[PDB]
Amino acid sequence: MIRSVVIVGGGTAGWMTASYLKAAFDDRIDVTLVESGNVRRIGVGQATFSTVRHFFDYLGLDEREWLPRCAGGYKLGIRFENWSEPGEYFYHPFERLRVVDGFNMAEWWLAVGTSFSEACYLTHRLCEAKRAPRMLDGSLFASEQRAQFPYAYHFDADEVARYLSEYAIARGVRHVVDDVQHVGQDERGWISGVHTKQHGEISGDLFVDCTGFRGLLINQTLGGRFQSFSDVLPNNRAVALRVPRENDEDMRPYTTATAMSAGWMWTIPLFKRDGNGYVYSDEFISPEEAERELRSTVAPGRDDLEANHIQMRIGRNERTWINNCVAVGLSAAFVEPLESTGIFFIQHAIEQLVKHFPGERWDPVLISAYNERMAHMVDGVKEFLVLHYKGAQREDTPYWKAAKTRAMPDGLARKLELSASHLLDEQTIYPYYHGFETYSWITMNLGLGIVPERPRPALLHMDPAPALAEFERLRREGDELIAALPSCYEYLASIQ
Amino acid sequence: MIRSVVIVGGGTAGWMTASYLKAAFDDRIDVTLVESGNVRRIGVGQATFSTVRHFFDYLGLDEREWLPRCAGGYKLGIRFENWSEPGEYFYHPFERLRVVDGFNMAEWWLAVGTSFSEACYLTHRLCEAKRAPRMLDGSLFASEQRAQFPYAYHFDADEVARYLSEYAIARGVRHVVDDVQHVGQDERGWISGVHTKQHGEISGDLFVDCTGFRGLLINQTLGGRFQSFSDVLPNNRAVALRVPRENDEDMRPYTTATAMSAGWMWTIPLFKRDGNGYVYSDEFISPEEAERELRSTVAPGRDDLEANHIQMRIGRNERTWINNCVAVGLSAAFVEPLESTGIFFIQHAIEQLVKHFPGERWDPVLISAYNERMAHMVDGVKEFLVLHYKGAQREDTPYWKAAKTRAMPDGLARKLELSASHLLDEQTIYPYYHGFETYSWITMNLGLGIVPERPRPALLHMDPAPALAEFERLRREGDELIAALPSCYEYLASIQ
Ligand SMILES: Cc1cc2nc3c(=O)[nH]c(=O)nc-3n(C[C@H](O)[C@H](O)[C@H](O)COP(=O)(O)OP(=O)(O)OC[C@H]3O[C@@H](n4cnc5c(N)ncnc54)[C@H](O)[C@@H]3O)c2cc1C
Ligand SMILES: Cc1cc2nc3c(=O)[nH]c(=O)nc-3n(C[C@H](O)[C@H](O)[C@H](O)COP(=O)(O)OP(=O)(O)OC[C@H]3O[C@@H](n4cnc5c(N)ncnc54)[C@H](O)[C@@H]3O)c2cc1C
Ligand SMILES: [Cl-]
Ligand SMILES: [Cl-]
Numbered sequence: 004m005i006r007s008v009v010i011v012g013g014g015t016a017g018w019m020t021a022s023y024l025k026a027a028f029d030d031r032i033d034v035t036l037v038e039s040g041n042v043r044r045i046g047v048g049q050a051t052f053s054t055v056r057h058f059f060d061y062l063g064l065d066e067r068e069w070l071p072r073c074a075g076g077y078k079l080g081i082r083f084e085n086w087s088e089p090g091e092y093f094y095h096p097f098e099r100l101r102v103v104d105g106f107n108m109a110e111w112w113l114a115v116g117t118s119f120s121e122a123c124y125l126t127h128r129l130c131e132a133k134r135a136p137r138m139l140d141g142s143l144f145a146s147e148q149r150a151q152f153p154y155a156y157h158f159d160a161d162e163v164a165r166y167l168s169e170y171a172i173a174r175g176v177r178h179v180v181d182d183v184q185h186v187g188q189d190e191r192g193w194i195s196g197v198h199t200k201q202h203g204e205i206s207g208d209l210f211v212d213c214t215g216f217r218g219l220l221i222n223q224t225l226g227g228r229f230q231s232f233s234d235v236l237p238n239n240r241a242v243a244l245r246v247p248r249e250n251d252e253d254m255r256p257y258t259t260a261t262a263m264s265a266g267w268m269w270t271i272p273l274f275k276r277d278g279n280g281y282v283y284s285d286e287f288i289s290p291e292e293a294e295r296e297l298r299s300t301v302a303p304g305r306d307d308l309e310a311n312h313i314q315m316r317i318g319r320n321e322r323t324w325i326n327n328c329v330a331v332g333l334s335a336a337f338v339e340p341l342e343s344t345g346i347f348f349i350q351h352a353i354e355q356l357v358k359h360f361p362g363e364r365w366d367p368v369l370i371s372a373y374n375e376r377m378a379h380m381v382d383g384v385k386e387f388l389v390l391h392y393k394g395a396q397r398e399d400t401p402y403w404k405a406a407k408t409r410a411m412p413d414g415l416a417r418k419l420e421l422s423a424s425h426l427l428d429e430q431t432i433y434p435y436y437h438g439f440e441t442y443s444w445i446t447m448n449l450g451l452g453i454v455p456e457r458p459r460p461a462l463l464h465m466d467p468a469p470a471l472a473e474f475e476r477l478r479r480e481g482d483e484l485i486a487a488l489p490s491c492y493e494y495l496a497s498i499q
Numbered sequence: 500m501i502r503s504v505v506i507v508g509g510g511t512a513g514w515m516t517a518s519y520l521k522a523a524f525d526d527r528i529d530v531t532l533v534e535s536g537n538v539r540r541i542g543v544g545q546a547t548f549s550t551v552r553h554f555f556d557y558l559g560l561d562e563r564e565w566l567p568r569c570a571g572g573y574k575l576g577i578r579f580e581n582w583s584e585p586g587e588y589f590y591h592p593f594e595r596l597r598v599v600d601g602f603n604m605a606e607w608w609l610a611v612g613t614s615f616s617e618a619c620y621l622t623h624r625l626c627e628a629k630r631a632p633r634m635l636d637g638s639l640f641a642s643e644q645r646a647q648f649p650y651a652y653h654f655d656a657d658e659v660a661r662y663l664s665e666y667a668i669a670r671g672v673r674h675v676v677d678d679v680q681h682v683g684q685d686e687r688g689w690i691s692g693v694h695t696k697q698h699g700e701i702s703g704d705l706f707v708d709c710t711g712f713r714g715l716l717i718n719q720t721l722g723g724r725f726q727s728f729s730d731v732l733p734n735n736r737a738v739a740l741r742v743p744r745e746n747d748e749d750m751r752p753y754t755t756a757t758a759m760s761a762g763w764m765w766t767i768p769l770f771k772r773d774g775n776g777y778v779y780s781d782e783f784i785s786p787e788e789a790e791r792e793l794r795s796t797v798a799p800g801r802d803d804l805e806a807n808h809i810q811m812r813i814g815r816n817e818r819t820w821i822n823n824c825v826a827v828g829l830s831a832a833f834v835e836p837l838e839s840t841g842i843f844f845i846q847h848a849i850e851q852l853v854k855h856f857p858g859e860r861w862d863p864v865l866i867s868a869y870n871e872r873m874a875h876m877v878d879g880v881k882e883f884l885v886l887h888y889k890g891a892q893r894e895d896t897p898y899w900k901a902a903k904t905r906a907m908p909d910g911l912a913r914k915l916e917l918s919a920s921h922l923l924d925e926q927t928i929y930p931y932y933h934g935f936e937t938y939s940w941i942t943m944n945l946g947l948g949i950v951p952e953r954p955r956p957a958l959l960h961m962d963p964a965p966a967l968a969e970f971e972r973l974r975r976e977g978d979e980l981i982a983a984l985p986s987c988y989e990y991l992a993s994i995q
Contacts, residue, residue: 004959031960105853358601362956368920369956376926424864430872434930460858460865463500464524 004363005208006033011183011197011220012213013038014045015160016332016349018167019058020211023353025174026062035177036168037197037205042182045215045333046161047243047311048271048278050078050258050343052438053097053153058350062170066156067141071499072166074274076157077136077256077491079126081342084261086451087396093118093450094257095342096126097153100442101477103470106462108477109426109445111470114458119449122474126152128481130257135494144484155343157258157271179205186224193326194220209361212330216316216337221323221330231318235389235412238266238339242294243280243311246302248272256491260341262395264288264296265402269340274495277301282315282339287402315339319381322374327365329356329373336381341391344384347438351380376436383437386412387444393419394451418444422453501704501857502529507679507693507716508709509534510541511656512828512845514663515554516707519849521670522558531673532664533693533701538678541711541829542657543739543807544767544774546574546754546839548934549593549649554846558666562652563637567995568662570769572653573632573752573987575622577838580757582947583892589614589946590753591838592622593649596938597973599966602958604973605922605941607966610954615945618970622648624977626753631990640980651839653754653767675701679710682720689822690716705857708826712812712833717819717826727814731885731908733783734762734835738790739776739807742798744768752987756837758891759792760784761898765836766797770991773797778811778835783898811835815877818870823861825852825869832877837887840880843934847876872932879933882908883940889915890947914940918949
């Protein structure tokens, strides 16, 4: 049995790890977190993925408890705007496709169909009407049933870290505010301790590197190799603004991803404000040009509002677990937030760290299994993201022209051939766990315009009546839900 | 739209296809089946896999209806006997493992455990007590709930074909009893029709090859390449006996697979009798030697009983769909019946044929996707079967010594390495659909003796109480079920 964990870094990565370890092992693990008082954590508004409910449940926290304390909002999906036809948008919702007579509604839609997402998903209407996913009495709109409509959240990154540090400290995590200046290694290259400015050497059995892009332990100390995705995903910078929303009722229960001239822009609706960020490649636009284009789009003349500029390290470490060090968060990997995966990567890395937790005999076969899982998680998402750029039909600036001809990860060419003939499915998407399911791959293809040439031929041999009835049910149930549900803001105000 | 299907062959493959097509498309497809009046279909007692319930449900047939008409029995799993030492055994049941605090009962069994199957599965007790999976009132023991304990069947192959021909003919399948003498091809190599002795040319749009090992269309006409698995799975012959049952209550609700001196032997319990078959490699034992060994084991002195000798073609076509011809059943592929997969391959080929049904354009991308799916289906099983021979600890004859050192498929080595350290899971088993789930891979490993060196270290850091309570629940629920359920025979007698 290993006795102690030392976490270096106090961002979302560090505190999620601390909290989860305590929830998992309680007093059967000792945990110390060391974080700098002067190197700032990434603090923007952030979107999450559908698995995030599980993390809070596991911690024993109800959404009514944590969400208001993190300036929280609801994410039913992502609205993708201006990617193909100008002014055309669509939704990528957290909602599974229904199945009629062995075929999902997307197959039926192609045969007997109004946009795809509007026809096939309740969530589409909920978004258009800016509904909350809960009735005022707190009950889920589905009436677990949470899996069928697995909505996620928007929140303030600083606040969630602040809230989790409190959770973790309340449960025995030793907290040290100091800078790590040197990382000690023993005669085998294993980490022996971290040397701080004012608290001496801090030691333990297992070191978790949550130091962000920097990768102080995994890269700077251990020589872990970082594999860049720039060749297939060139976006490398971001500029963000925090914009107050004059209207409450304008609060949208979804993230928006708007294609810009040389990248794309997020809109993440928090409780009293919207975060906006322009993710771009500095090969096609300067940071200054990018700030100007962002400002023009969301806050013209608002020079009172400060712009936050960030460089991104895009890609992943070959191995996120080397010797007795595991990297969690941006130290481990990162891709642009086009599908809100940052916190997903953190949660999964942590869940899997618990599953692959080391005993006193560090098992290299177990560690290698952990490393494969982490590689597949990010590689699957990388491939899914490249699909977004390949699906985008717009070709109006040098950036979009270059996205059209840019090299692809292995396997994506095949998925694009398949997609021109028929829909991807469980057997033909990326086969290893990467968060996303079949409906996500299909929805992006259909929304962006990668559409089968013709419907599935089997369908012509079948009775269309049950599918047509299902489409009618969906439109009907939609109508009813938007009449019964409070607005996104309404519900949130009622739980503050 | 294509209109007409011509099936050549009236074994299980042919009639399953005919029936399923009618159930799927009704009068929106024309189907003709041509079968020889003098080449016999494979007629032994057969075991099935868990998906088979879906096939009968799809046809609209309740088990009370079809099972008695096929001399049917229940299969709750497979009892593996003597794969290591004489008198030792374990079950591979159709039952999913329960999960406690994020870990399945197998992981808990290694940490806090009585054999593995006995500890972890209700089905173990049901098999030992020879229970039926249903109460006399017809209700499932689980109280869908059918997925949690997805039992299958034993039946007579001739009877099921006979029963399905009736189903299909009742629904408009044209039936022709004749020999196909020549298969015609157009200028492009596409099949134009099949020439019979007494009924002239029979034509259609789509040709299904259900001619068995022979592959009259797919191999003899089209020149499809057949990929042999003999290098990794040498068994190439079988000899079978049909043995009447003295005492009805000897009827077991499972298949038995007993390792023999140069292969293994099945016991398949039908309603009035047991089928027994010795599957073997003629490199290590002659067909005469094999018959003697079989006779000695299950029916000594019973020379009234006729032995049925069969050569097996083991492997798969590179492509089961070429031009306008799709191979279904033994014409497509076959592996030894160690895990009862023949009918499973038929059903999945058919289900996927409906999904990939061609339109007038014959989309080559769609066909290619079908071929990949069929290749994976069989390759996954092939790898699982080699695992059985690699896990077998016995080394007492040249056959078993040779099984120990025989070459493996790519990918298995890595799975064996993982297995010595920790349990396989969804990410580390064969990744494409091949019928079997994680619990099957794990259960075979633990049953055969491929056991992690030590329990999962994470477990030592956790409270064992909930798992211990679950084990107790399982033992308790087991006790109750064998007291409440009728015998396998009892229930079957009550529905004849
Ligand atoms: C522009 C942008 C947008 C994003 N949007 C989303 C989104 O919408 N949704 C989502 O899920 N994710 C998003 N992400 C990812 C998200 O920011 C991270 O996943 C998450 O906040 C965790 O970051 P981190 O904890 O790994 O690193 P950081 O927040 O950078 O924390 C690093 C920590 O290490 C400490 N540290 C560094 N060096 C030392 C040292 N020498 N001694 C002691 N301490 C040290 C620092 O003090 C700090 O506490 C986005 C990222 C970027 C860059
Ligand atoms: C020893 C053994 C044990 C098995 N055990 C199991 C088991 O336990 N569970 C399981 O699921 N599967 C098992 N299988 C597989 C099972 O036999 C088949 O999957 C299933 O019965 C279908 O076989 P088939 O229809 O493809 O071929 P066959 O039964 O061989 O049928 C071939 C048909 O083609 C016709 N035909 C051939 N040539 C012509 C021609 N020129 N003109 C007209 N008609 C022609 C024949 O008349 C016949 O009707 C086993 C197989 C073997 C060999
Ligand atoms: Cl992200
Ligand atoms: Cl079989």
